[PDB]
């Protein structure tokens, strides 16, 4: 893909920053991407109808930042912990 | 104070770097006993 | 000589599996069916065949032709989406899995009620079986004493359950609306986990450490006995020590694991994958039934005689006569001496000593509508509406029984490691199944479920569609729509 | 003879239903008792054996 | 090999005629009667499993004999207490 | 058990499948009847 | 063994004070009958 130089840059910063860093407990753990597999293929498109404004009243079932349509799943479960201002362009992204 | 988050959500005892020290990873999934755990802390577990 | 040996050998083998198919087709029917009862409702009694037996429930049958009321599920318009997608459908439900065989109608219903049966399935399976009363039972096991109720109180069992005849037909009759009342519940401590057992020694994390009889042949010279000699202490009982600090774990530890498995080649995972399937929708149950109620709509009112006050007082399905909407509007049941005073004289001598429900009528049908949204999570592993593989699972498995067959006959293992294979299962059944079961246990949609309002995810979003909507129940798409 | 009241798993077992809905589906059988009961406040002692 | 064949083949036809009239018994009976225990009143009682393993087992253990190699789960401490009672007067150890 | 209680039930065949009236009556004669069986073993020796 | 199981205590008392249930713990008198018709209960222990 690339050169040498990029590598190595991010190797010394791997090897510098992160161990500085580790002055705690943390440590490297393992993933489950096995299991999430079928768990980030998840879309929720708005019910807007077409040629319509979308109002910016906080009270009102179109406001994805808002509590108005959480959806469990895990995303709006740990919504509490990472609230995030999303729209639409990232879950067309990880559609994509 | 985590008492909302499972203990084995993504996490599993996978040593590989021996730069990383968790003591309190173990001790909170498995559920390793007091002589266990002072095994632990005298000798880092080492994969032979 | 041995050409004509393997056709016959052939001819045999599809022989032999024509004849298992057509045992397996003839086995399905039943026809059992039950005598008149005592005018079902009041309105409309259950009558033979299903002419007069949908009287009062016209408005959900006009949607429901699809299974022309003989025991099938109809669900609502998600349904009807998935039936039209059938094309491409994600899910394994209809379309007769792949094109390598399969049907319509009855095998539907059939593949549908096998998909939910899985602890056993060997040769036999039935059809038309409803699975309420066992969850009503565990709700209760736990809720006993837990309690945490608004105003009414009730503690006895056996004149829940004695008045079976009028049981099933509050059953059929409320059970309509899968929504509920209260607010918040338990609904986790349950926690069903699967039973298994590898290797041994002693319980981690616990209360005591090896007992005081290890401490006491070690500070001794005792030892541990030799593998090689087996040699008891005799010790133990000569210095006559005050007692000690003895605990009861290891009686709960030891629990209850002696069933068998319904598979080849051991091990048990065919049932495990699809129960931890469909424990997942514990969560979507939980959430589909904390906020609703019944008042009655202009729609769903089209023949009534006494049920003037009914939309009112709540959920009678009889009269209420004055309790039932004590509270706000009506709420749980409480209270029965007009039904047992009209039973005794009308209905007692005729239905007394039966079962619940049914299975060659519409009676399972009040599962089937609670049951709307937790059989939609048992397709997907996370549950999600998202496309996903899990169509191919009976062809795998089908495949690889086959694939085992075939070896047994032909081959005899050998070279096939089927030593390491059960090793390491002997850990993957304890390992990975206990980490499933205590993933999640607790659904945080609490503020949501009162703030988003749109639990009215099957029809438009309005207070009258809401209204009616929460007043039927899951609002089954209509007919004439193939 | 057991007969100990009509109760919950606090009694002997009462814990017959645990894997009883597999393959069971909804058995039938002839009609011997008649009459029906109610459920109204809390129960206390009796005698059903 | 042939030998081997042939006892495959017979055991084969054997299986497939119990199966056969199995079926033609179930057939014949009017309706699948299965055992059942249950102590309440008028419910469903439970659902035991097919007494039909011991061909299988033989089977299973006879085209695979010189494998297994598993630990085996025990019936309760009736081991270590048996060899305990034994081991005072007249040790026997395991023999077998 | 015997009939006639509070609830005006008055009924003709029903006379154990009722559970209040009948079992307030009933449980407190046969609260007496309870069998009790008490006898002691010993090992002894074993002959022959 | 036949006589010498019934003694005096009532077969609560002697299953759950006199340690006859040790070897195989099970429930009270209503899956007593399972517990002696299925049998082999197994136990936390599989051999090295």
Redesign the interface.
């Known amino acids: 893909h690339h050169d040498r130089e990029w590598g190595i840059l991010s190797k010394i910063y791997y090897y510098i920053v992160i161990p500085a860093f580790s002055r705690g407990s943390c440590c490297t753990m393992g993933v489950r991407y096995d299991r999430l597999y079928p768990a980030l293929q998840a879309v929720i498109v708005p019910e807007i109808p077409a040629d319509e404004e979308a109002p910016t009243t906080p009270e009102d079932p179109r406001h994805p930042l808002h509590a108005h349509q959480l959806v469990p799943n895990s995303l709006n479960v740990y919504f509490h912990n990472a609230h995030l201002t999303v729209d639409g362009d990232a879950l067309l992204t990880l559609q994509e | 104070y985590d008492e909302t988050i499972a203990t084995g959500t993504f996490f599993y005892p996978v040593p590989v770097n021996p730069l990383f020290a968790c003591p309190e990873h173990l001790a909170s999934l498995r559920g390793m006993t007091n002589a266990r755990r002072v095994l632990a802390k005298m000798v880092p577990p080492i994969p032979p | 000589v041995l050409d004509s040996l393997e056709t016959a ?1 052939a001819e ?1 083998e599809e022989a ?1 599996a024509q ?2 198919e057509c ?1 397996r087709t ?2 399905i029917r ?1 026809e ?1 069916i ?1 005598p008149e009862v005592q005018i079902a409702k009041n309105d409309a009694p259950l009558q033979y065949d299903t002419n007069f037996q949908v009287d009062f429930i016209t408005l959900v049958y006009l949607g429901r032709a699809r299974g022309n009321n003989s025991p099938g599920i109809v669900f609502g318009p998600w349904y009807r989406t998935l039936q039209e997608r059938l094309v491409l459908d994600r899910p394994v439900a209809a379309r007769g899995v792949d094109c390598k065989d399969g049907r319509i109608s009855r095998t539907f219903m059939n593949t549908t009620v096998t998909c939910l ?1 899985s ?13 309420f ?2 969850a009503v ?2 709700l209760y ?1 736990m809720y ?1 004493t837990s309690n945490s109720v608004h105003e009414p ?14 049981y099933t037909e509050t059953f059929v009759n409320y059970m309509t609306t899968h929504e509920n009342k209260n607010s918040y519940q338990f609904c986790y401590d349950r926690l069903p986990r699967d039973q298994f ?5 002693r ?3 616990g209360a005591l ?1 090896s007992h005081s009889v290890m401490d006491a042949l070690i500070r001794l010279q005792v030892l541990p006995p030799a593998p090689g ?4 202490g005799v010790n133990d009982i000569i210095d006559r020590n005050h007692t000690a600090y003895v605990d009861k774990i ?2 709960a ?2 629990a ?3 069933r ?1 498995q ?1 598979v080849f080649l051991m091990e048990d995972q065919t049932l495990l994958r699809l129960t931890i399937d469909t424990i997942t929708a514990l ?1 979507l149950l939980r ?1 589909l039934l904390w906020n609703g109620n019944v008042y009655g709509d202009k729609l769903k009112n089209n023949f009534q005689l006494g049920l003037i006050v009914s939309e009112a007082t709540g959920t009678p399905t009889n009269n209420v006569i004055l309790r039932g909407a004590t509270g706000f509007d009506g709420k749980f049941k ?4 007009n ?3 009209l ?2 004289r009308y209905i ?12 060659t009528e519409m ?1 399972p049908g009040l599962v089937a509508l609670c049951l709307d949204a937790h059989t939609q999570l048992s397709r ?3 549950g ?1 509406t ?4 899990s169509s191919g699972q009976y062809q795998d498995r089908l495949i690889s029984l086959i694939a085992l067959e075939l070896e ?3 081959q ?2 050998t070279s096939l490691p ?2 390491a294979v ?2 390491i299962h ?1 850990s993957v059944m304890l390992q990975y199944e ?2 499933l079961g ?3 246990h607790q ?3 609490r ?2 479920l009162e ?4 639990l009215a995810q099957f029809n438009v ?1 309005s207070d009258y569609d809401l209204l009616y909507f929460v007043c039927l129940g899951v609002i089954p798409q209509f007919a004439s729509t193939p």
């Open positions: 050998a045999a032999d004849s298992e045992t003839e086995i039943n059992s039950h049966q602890a056993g399935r060997m040769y036999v399976g039935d059809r038309a079986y409803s699975a009363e066992c039972l565990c096991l006993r109180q009730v503690s006895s069992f056996g004149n829940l359950i004695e008045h079976l005849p009028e057992h590898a290797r041994g020694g319980y981690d994390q450490t000699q087996f040699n008891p290891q009686q530890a030891a209850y694991l002696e068998a319904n969560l959430r409480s209270g029965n001496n039904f047992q005073f039973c005794e007692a001598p005729l239905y007394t000593l039966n079962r619940t429900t049914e299975l009676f997907g592993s996370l999600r998202v496309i996903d593989i047994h006959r032909r005899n293992v089927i030593a059960v090793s002997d206990r980490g205590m993933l999640m659904p945080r949609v503020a949501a703030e988003s309002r749109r979003n």
